[PDB]
Design a protein around this ligand. Structure first.
Ligand SMILES: [Mg+2]
Ligand SMILES: [Mg+2]
Ligand SMILES: [Mg+2]
Ligand SMILES: [Mg+2]
Ligand SMILES: [Mg+2]
Ligand SMILES: [Mg+2]
Ligand SMILES: [Mg+2]
Ligand SMILES: [Mg+2]
Ligand SMILES: [Mg+2]
Ligand SMILES: [Mg+2]
Ligand SMILES: [Mg+2]
Ligand SMILES: [Mg+2]
Ligand SMILES: [Mg+2]
Ligand SMILES: [Mg+2]
Ligand SMILES: [Mg+2]
Ligand SMILES: [Mg+2]
Ligand SMILES: [Mg+2]
Ligand SMILES: [Mg+2]
Ligand SMILES: [Mg+2]
Ligand SMILES: [Mg+2]
Ligand SMILES: [Mg+2]
Ligand SMILES: [Mg+2]
Ligand SMILES: [Mg+2]
Lengths: 145, 155, 184
RNA sequence: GGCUGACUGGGCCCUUGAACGCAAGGGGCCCAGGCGGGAAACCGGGGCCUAGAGAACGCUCGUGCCCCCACCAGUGGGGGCC
RNA sequence: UCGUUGCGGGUCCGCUUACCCGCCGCAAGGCGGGGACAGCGGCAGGCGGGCUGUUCGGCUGGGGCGGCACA
RNA sequence: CUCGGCUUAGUUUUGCCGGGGGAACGCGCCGGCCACUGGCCGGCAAGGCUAAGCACGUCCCGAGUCCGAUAGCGCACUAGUA
RNA sequence: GCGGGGAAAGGAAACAUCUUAGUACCCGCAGGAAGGGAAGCCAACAGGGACCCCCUGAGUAGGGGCGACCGAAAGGGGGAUAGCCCAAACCAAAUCCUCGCGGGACAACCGUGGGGAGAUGUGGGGCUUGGGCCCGGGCAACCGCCGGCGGGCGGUAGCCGAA
């Protein structure tokens, strides 16, 4: 339902059009840590097809999107979908690192935390910090699920 | 003697109500259902099965029941199943150059209309008739010779 | 709805304006690359998968750039009746998509063209991506779709023997469960 | 002086075209409808007679409670016979 | 004329990144100029023996000119 | 859908190519000889494969109301040779 | 045989639309055949049921300086007969390839180790008698890979054959 021509109206310089806000390296590394912890202790999903279905089905808590997707239109729908379903999401710099944190042998363009077993406390803190970045960039808040 | 399905010839407006029967492509699923078979089982017994056909003819049902009893009592031997017995796919070379990809199939007209109505088919069909002088291509201008001769001889 | 359904939105009305912004930058690079280039991944992933693309060893995706418009019809230089003298508006019975597939095949000798799809247009050029498969690769040869291009042989002794056994077992089963009902 | 027959629907014959095939055009004699002139008879289907005359396809107009257009009905449109 | 043709401001101004032109560079890319023009493709009008196909009738005291003795 | 063009029996109605515009989604879409509306009927395009039954004659086999060294293939032979 | 480019002479008793002809010829690309082939079909309220080829429909409908001339399709009779898959829904690495070693009819495959592909999705599932999804019941399950061993027949030289 979100109209992409206003959502993606003003892209950031040096980033693909689907990147809406700039994420510092410290925040990205924390997200990768949470996804790794959630993998051993809770439930995660990885890959665009599985991440998209989790968001649609309402089972997502945190969505991680890599910034180096070579044809950008592979993942560009995900930020729009997360805003529609009010699921917090963050950008990570490398899909190769996102895949490794997801526990696979290939890169992942996207990954999603379904349940954070032991990372739930850290996940809440990460979502708050992401919310400050969105406010700085002018986007409304997305509460932690 | 394995029965052959009997179906009705489509009754055209031109016919004016006259109807006839013909041999069908296969027995319909409705006819097979009345004798307790599905498409797979009937095909394994050597019967021609037509899953497209909707009609159910009692004469077809009766022929099936009679022959099945003979088969299940050891009096008749079913022929080989009406399923593929060989698989023969050749390696393809130069599909793009011979117009066999989807783009070629579109330009040849095969997406929008039947093979028989495509322009390359018309070109080849008429070339053969003229080469063999078959049917109407034995005489060029046949229609006009007939037309003028009819006027003179029917005046 | 799969992610592939969402990926198609960039070639629909809802996403055209955002996609058309992106291509204005991308096409600058594509106008300076070679006319035929092998790419790691297809540009329209959802479209490529529908047409048979999979990221296996021996599957080649090539981007082809060619000049649009009508083909280069020549003005005849000898005697013709007036109907056969025109130039403007006369086109070829081949589409540019077939021309693109054929040019790609020349760059990859021995490979088979599976399919192709349109990617982008600019004022002078049209861009296609062509899917090619290597029929000599063991991964390709056993694929159920690619075997239709690369060839497939099943001995008649295998299928016929299997069918004869299935027919024999069916008749025995139908003797018990069907013969009374038929005669009843 | 009074009028519009330089009429509507048709048929037959003569000439063009000799005896002897063969356009268009022109002329003559009638039947029916409805008129004009005349007491009536009768005459009027242009000019006292012999010249002023044009196929197919296409278009256009007139005409009909008119015929047809693809499974059925309707609206617009198209086609058909004279 | 349609498309290429984009971005700001009130049909006009500006801009450059498209596109075009030149220089340097093996290439990467840099410099300068022009600039949404031009160029290019489609469509439309004009000029167009530059080029292609053809027609240039008949009768006739031979043909031609005349005449129409061509209806 | 529209414009140009080649083609087709395809005709206000065939297929396609090129220029420009350009959907919807199964509660949808497509077809039923001009367009649209209603009804009814039939279906599910824009991805891929598929034996058998059909064309041909360098070659092999058989046949002949065919020719018989100016004939019959150009060549019955150190002929596609000199 | 398949895709593309593509005339004129001649005919119309001139000639341009038209025909000749999508022919000659040119360019590209296959097979022992090619191409086609599994209903967004045809029909008309009655029903057919993938395709190609043969006979017919038929010189009919229709196209056409409505001229010359061009010209179907459905339907009917035959030859022959055969039906399936990719993508997607759902699951999410359960997958494929290659090499070494051991086993395994010299194979497929099994066990183990290394390398490559693979979340931008390998694989499972699914193909109008639509499917996915949930519940129950049943084996005649279903689907696929290898072509070893035994047997038979046929082809590629020949042998016997009356008086
Ligand atoms: Mg003919
Ligand atoms: Mg000529
Ligand atoms: Mg005369
Ligand atoms: Mg006479
Ligand atoms: Mg006269
Ligand atoms: Mg009809
Ligand atoms: Mg301009
Ligand atoms: Mg211009
Ligand atoms: Mg000249
Ligand atoms: Mg003249
Ligand atoms: Mg003369
Ligand atoms: Mg003169
Ligand atoms: Mg579909
Ligand atoms: Mg000789
Ligand atoms: Mg002799
Ligand atoms: Mg000739
Ligand atoms: Mg002539
Ligand atoms: Mg001449
Ligand atoms: Mg074949
Ligand atoms: Mg084939
Ligand atoms: Mg023709
Ligand atoms: Mg898969
Ligand atoms: Mg002997």
């Amino acid at each position: 339902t979100i109209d992409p021509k206003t959502f993606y109206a003003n892209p950031l310089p040096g980033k693909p059009f689907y990147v809406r806000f700039e994420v510092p390296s410290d925040v990205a590394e924390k997200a990768l840590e949470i996804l790794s912890i959630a993998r051993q202790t809770g439930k995660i999903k990885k890959g665009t097809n599985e991440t998209t279905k989790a968001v649609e089905r309402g089972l997502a808590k945190l969505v991680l999107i890599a910034e180096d997707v070579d044809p950008p239109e592979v993942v560009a729908h995900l930020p729009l979908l997360c805003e529609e379903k009010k699921v917090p999401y963050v950008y990570v710099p490398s899909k190769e690192k996102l895949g490794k944190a997801a526990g696979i042998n290939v890169a992942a363009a996207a990954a999603v935390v379904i349940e954070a077993g032991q990372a739930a406390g850290e996940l809440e803190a990460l979502v708050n910090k992401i919310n400050e970045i969105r406010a700085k960039h002018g986007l409304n808040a997305i509460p932690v699920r | 003697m394995i029965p052959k399905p009997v179906v009705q010839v489509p009754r055209s407006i031109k016919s004016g109500g006259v109807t006839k029967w013909k041999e069908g492509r296969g027995f319909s699923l409705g006819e097979l259902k009345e004798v307790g078979l599905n498409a797979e089982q009937a095909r394994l017994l050597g019967l021609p099965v037509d899953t497209r056909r909707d009609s159910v003819w009692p004469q077809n049902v009766e022929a099936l029941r009679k022959w099945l009893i003979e088969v299940l009592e050891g009096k008749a031997t079913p022929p080989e199943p009406t399923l593929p017995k060989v698989v023969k796919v050749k390696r393809k070379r130069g599909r793009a150059f011979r117009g066999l990809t989807s783009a070629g199939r579109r330009s040849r007209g095969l997406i929008s209309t039947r093979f028989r109505e495509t322009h390359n088919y018309k070109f080849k069909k008429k070339a053969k008739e003229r080469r063999l002088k078959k049917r109407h291509e034995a005489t060029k201008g046949l229609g006009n010779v007939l037309r003028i001769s009819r006027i003179i001889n029917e005046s | 709805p799969s992610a592939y359904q969402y990926m198609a939105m960039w070639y629909r009305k809802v996403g055209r304006e955002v996609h058309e912004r992106l291509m204005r930058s991308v096409l600058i690079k594509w106008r300076k690359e070679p006319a035929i280039v092998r790419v790691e991944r297809p540009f329209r992933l959802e479209r490529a998968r529908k047409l048979g693309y999979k990221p296996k060893q021996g599957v080649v995706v090539a981007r082809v750039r060619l000049i649009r418009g009508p083909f280069n019809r020549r003005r005849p230089d000898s005697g013709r009746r007036p109907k056969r003298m025109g130039v403007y508006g006369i086109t070829a019975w081949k589409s540019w998509r077939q021309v693109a597939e054929e040019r790609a095949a020349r760059k990859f000798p021995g490979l088979e063209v599976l399919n192709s799809y349109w990617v982008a247009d600019d004022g002078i050029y049209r861009y296609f991506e062509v899917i090619l498969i290597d029929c000599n690769q063991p991964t390709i040869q056993r694929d159920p779709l690619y075997s239709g291009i690369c060839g497939r042989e099943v001995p008649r002794r295998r299928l016929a023997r299997r069918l004869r056994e299935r027919q024999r077992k069916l008749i025995e089963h139908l003797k018990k469960t069907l013969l009374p009902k038929l005669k009843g």
